[PDB]
Amino acid sequence: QNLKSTDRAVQQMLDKAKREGIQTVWDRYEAMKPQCGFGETGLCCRHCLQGPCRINPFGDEPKVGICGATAEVIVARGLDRSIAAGAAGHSGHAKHLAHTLKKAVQGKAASYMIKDRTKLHSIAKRLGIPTEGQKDEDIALEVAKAALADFHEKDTPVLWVTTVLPPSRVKVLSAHGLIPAGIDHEIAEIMHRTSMGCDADAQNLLLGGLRCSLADLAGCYMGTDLADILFGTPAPVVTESNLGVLKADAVNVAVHGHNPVLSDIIVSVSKEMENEARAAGATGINVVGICCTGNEVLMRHGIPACTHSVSQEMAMITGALDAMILDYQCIQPSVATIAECTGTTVITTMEMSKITGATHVNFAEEAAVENAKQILRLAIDTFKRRKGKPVEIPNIKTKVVAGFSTEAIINALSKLNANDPLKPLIDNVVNGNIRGVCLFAGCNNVKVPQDQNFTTIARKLLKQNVLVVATGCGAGALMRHGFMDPANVDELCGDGLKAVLTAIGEANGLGGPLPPVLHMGSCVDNSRAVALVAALANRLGVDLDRLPVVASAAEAMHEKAVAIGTWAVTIGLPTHIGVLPPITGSLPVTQILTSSVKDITGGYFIVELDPETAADKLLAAINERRAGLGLPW
Amino acid sequence: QNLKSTDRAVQQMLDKAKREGIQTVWDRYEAMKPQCGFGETGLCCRHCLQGPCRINPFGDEPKVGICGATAEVIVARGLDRSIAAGAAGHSGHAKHLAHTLKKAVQGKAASYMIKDRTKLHSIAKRLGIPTEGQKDEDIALEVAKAALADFHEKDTPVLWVTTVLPPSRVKVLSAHGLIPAGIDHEIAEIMHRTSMGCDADAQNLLLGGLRCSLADLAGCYMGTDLADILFGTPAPVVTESNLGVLKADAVNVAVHGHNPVLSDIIVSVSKEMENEARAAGATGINVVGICCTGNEVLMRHGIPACTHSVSQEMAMITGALDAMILDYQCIQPSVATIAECTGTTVITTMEMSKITGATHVNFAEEAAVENAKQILRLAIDTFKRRKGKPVEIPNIKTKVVAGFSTEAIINALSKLNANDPLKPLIDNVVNGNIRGVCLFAGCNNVKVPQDQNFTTIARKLLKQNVLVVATGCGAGALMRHGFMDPANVDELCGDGLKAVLTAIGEANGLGGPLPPVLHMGSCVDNSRAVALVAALANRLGVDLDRLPVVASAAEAMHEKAVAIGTWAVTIGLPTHIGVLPPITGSLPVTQILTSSVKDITGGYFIVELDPETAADKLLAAINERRAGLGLPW
Numbered sequence A, B: 001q002n003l004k005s006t007d008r009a010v011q012q013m014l015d016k017a018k019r020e021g022i023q024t025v026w027d028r029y030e031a032m033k034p035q036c037g038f039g040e041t042g043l044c045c046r047h048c049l050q051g052p053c054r055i056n057p058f059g060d061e062p063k064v065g066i067c068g069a070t071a072e073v074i075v076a077r078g079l080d081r082s083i084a085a086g087a088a089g090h091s092g093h094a095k096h097l098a099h100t101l102k103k104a105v106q107g108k109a110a111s112y113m114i115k116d117r118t119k120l121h122s123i124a125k126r127l128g129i130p131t132e133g134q135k136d137e138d139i140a141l142e143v144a145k146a147a148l149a150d151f152h153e154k155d156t157p158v159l160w161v162t163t164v165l166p167p168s169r170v171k172v173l174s175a176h177g178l179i180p181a182g183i184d185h186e187i188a189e190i191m192h193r194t195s196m197g198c199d200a201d202a203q204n205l206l207l208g209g210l211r212c213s214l215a216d217l218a219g220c221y222m223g224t225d226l227a228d229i230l231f232g233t234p235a236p237v238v239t240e241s242n243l244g245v246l247k248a249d250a251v252n253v254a255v256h257g258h259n260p261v262l263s264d265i266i267v268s269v270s271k272e273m274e275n276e277a278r279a280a281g282a283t284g285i286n287v288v289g290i291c292c293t294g295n296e297v298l299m300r301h302g303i304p305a306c307t308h309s310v311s312q313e314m315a316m317i318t319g320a321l322d323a324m325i326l327d328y329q330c331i332q333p334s335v336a337t338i339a340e341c342t343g344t345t346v347i348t349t350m351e352m353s354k355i356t357g358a359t360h361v362n363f364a365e366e367a368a369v370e371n372a373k374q375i376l377r378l379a380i381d382t383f384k385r386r387k388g389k390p391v392e393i394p395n396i397k398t399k400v401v402a403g404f405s406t407e408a409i410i411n412a413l414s415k416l417n418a419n420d421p422l423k424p425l426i427d428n429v430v431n432g433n434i435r436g437v438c439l440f441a442g443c444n445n446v447k448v449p450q451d452q453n454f455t456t457i458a459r460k461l462l463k464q465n466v467l468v469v470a471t472g473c474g475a476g477a478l479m480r481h482g483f484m485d486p487a488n489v490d491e492l493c494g495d496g497l498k499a500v501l502t503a504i505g506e507a508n509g510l511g512g513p514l515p516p517v518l519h520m521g522s523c524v525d526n527s528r529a530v531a532l533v534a535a536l537a538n539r540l541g542v543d544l545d546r547l548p549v550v551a552s553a554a555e556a557m558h559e560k561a562v563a564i565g566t567w568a569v570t571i572g573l574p575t576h577i578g579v580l581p582p583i584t585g586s587l588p589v590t591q592i593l594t595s596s597v598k599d600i601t602g603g604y605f606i607v608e609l610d611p612e613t614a615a616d617k618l619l620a621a622i623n624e625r626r627a628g629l630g631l632p633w
Ligand code: SF4
Pocket: A045, A046, A047, A048, A049, A050, A051, A052, A053, A065, A066, A067, A068, A069, A074, A195, A196, A197
């Protein structure tokens, strides 16, 4: 089972699923092998009904699609569509929050409000929205309107790109025509240009993809901005992670998906129904997190994270998961069938994301509190049904310090230098105590033993004094293996990094250091890392492609991860991906994405499936940036 | 070669390509066989990097995608993405025209203007835009603004849906949640909901697809509206079609693609450079059409159609095609490589549609006349280079009467009844002289001998007194086989249909009848057939799903055709498709699309690859509608 997951709780539940005959994601993967080599390399096209077309990676015919589409075109078109689909997910999440904020301040949804007035005003300032002499509800209405306007063409480009990157970066991107005109506009243009008989030049196609990836970044940054206004900007918080945060004697309710518009309300409402649960025989309602919706409520409320990504079914296998509350994205639809065997009540809540066999609750912000109590009652009902059943909850959990929004990191740093808070970080980059910064992002992937790349790479970078930040299921992997527990700093961190985390932790009234890895939040909160890096760039007066900052989508899976990886490259970062994206069937495309793009944006992909090699390549990229700045390394 | 194309000109050029060693679309098809059965049935998914996932149509594992996605989900998700891609193409075309109109009336592009003032005012009226006391430029500015606003969410739904269908149809669609909120909004929502771990209920997915197909219809109808304002509403015109419209002693220039924003200007400008060509040794500039951009200038200017769809490469094989001027959609990228062997200058003009090896001219409406003269000079240059080369132009062409916009059909009918022009048509439906109406739409497809389904089906329907209208490459097929020549009415048409076409033709000062098939224009001009059918519905006081009207995408290929077929079903029509869409891998999805959808929209797909059987099924559908109206049949 350690070939399937490096997480010991997951291994224990894999043994249980096996003896109970419950099929898992790993079983369905084994049943899918050998996978199709045309698809894996990108050399398959189904964009018209003359297809499917395939191209032999090597050998004889077929060498070209039926319409004349070359390997280069087919691979670039497929990649572009994955970027657009990712942009559609992150920006659909952000669009939903924009409508939620508008509803809140127009009086149409009392469960929602402006919780972070400071963030609201700073966003308005960044966008050029006048605040002086405005009431907060009118400022927020203007902010929501601007958010919705970035989805279509207008007299300005997408402001959630142009106002969040350094002007010098915006200038480089505009010179290449890469600034998106509108988020949904770019998504539609990708779908058009990649349809049959349209764009058929790999470089032209890929430039479109980079522009669409910046539409994805805009949606991520919008999502983070709006969720912080509505639900509060995260600050440092202490909690726990892994299956051992389930409790047999409580009603265990997982919030799973990406958009916390409802799961933030579920958190609040569950706290008040602690007595309706006590009357059903439970100690209380135990809300736990899965995937990014879990990250959102972990970052803001300290809700413990139960599990992530590829292992999400295992939470159910314990027998203790009374309800799983779903919004959208990264939910294995197998959960609706596994629930028949584990007793979990699986509940969908979003109109465009239903699963056959799952109960559906038509959530509306106008009715959020009522929907939440309806769902929590089903959970309580489900707890009642398992009175006297034995559960197998692995008694395995880690301590997690998290909540490191960019505002929180700057505040923590300000305790070492109140009026120039980035300077202590830059000072230690310069003197070598911090070699560089690496962002771990993305998903787990059944092809990679769960968490093996994240932890292998993180370990090598940390010993080399790299400051590691993480989001999404990269943060989930690292938290479940103890990388967010400050007690592990001595074991994990080089002496220079230890000294810096210790200095900052002690200065913030903490028993000791910051944790080994800084959890910056959900997948849309990759935007927070952009905020941090853009702020460092502006403090140093250089562009992002001169900073010793890298990114690693160490076990990527979702179209969203392809979009993120692509905008990481577009804003100027060396960007590792530890699973094969479907590009190797075209050497020209691969050479653009791993080399020539350097000359356009300064970033570039590092495709490397061996995690020790990937760490060495990420270190070399960091050290090359250091040398470009004239710094020792 | 008759196994490849039923067009004798195409056969002759296929012989030439063979002896010259030029690879064609049919050669690349033969090299692709046997095609992948997972893809053909829809049982393949590459929506995340755990894939590719396939599902065996029958047998043992794999039975389910790695994430748990069932055959039903995978097939519905793939279909939805094809609908969204089609919507992206038609609506990108319309969006471009909207920006063109706005530029024209804001003084920023003198080559463009309001040519059809009557159409402008009627559109404004339909949309609720006040005209009384407005100048035309301000009305048109408002119309263009409304067009652009339909691409995003706003306080109204998409008006180019809700103002173009009968209120009773709009009510049925709203009751099922099928009215699109915004064109690019729906495209993005499809891409989101079909991404990994989101929507996983076949019925929910397919309802999303029907809504997105109405976003496609809106883009088609917008495109037709705006092109008519800018370039004129078509009226009956006489011209010719097939390769014999090439002339060895002229500069032959093909306009190819879909959006005529530039090719309409090329038509005008070529007429004035007739003397610059004469000085290079040519008789003049001979502009000819390929595919839908060709249909646009055929409908408006009588430009002869050279060829269509699957056989587009054959125009080049003659050796006489000096230039091929490309915008986007349905262009085989092989043309850029075949040009090296035929001497044709292939020119791209749209920034998001380039082809490696083709010359690119950065067309801007602000510079249209200058771009056109630049391109026509390259063509003249190319004619000079083939002084004294022999060409092989098959001496094969047909006579084509076309230009049957809905306005033109109503006007033609008005000569039989001035104040109730639809009544003569309805009278003859009721008395059986017209059994029903069939719209032929869509592409050719290399899998089907070129034109065989269009002509086989058309022949049977016409002998049974069906009024046949056609668009796009369905119109192209029928024109090249003589179905738009009124001299063939006696051979092709039943006595009742003949009597009606004769009555109308004679009443419109014509030597004789209307042609056997009414050419209603390009692919976006499928919207014209909707206008006609909606007008008939409103005159009778019934909804479209009670009218004896059917549609046939007899040889479909492009994602656009899937979108059209789907909105034909959604607005209430029995809709034949003569190639297999990728749905047969899921019986539940197939049963929804061919049966249960009847109960939602009244329309339904008829999947039938044998054209004689398909004609029988279309006749049965027409006759069932007749019986529902209480009419003989
Ligand atoms: S778009 Fe071209 S390569 Fe793709 S399926 Fe169609 S014919 Fe094949």
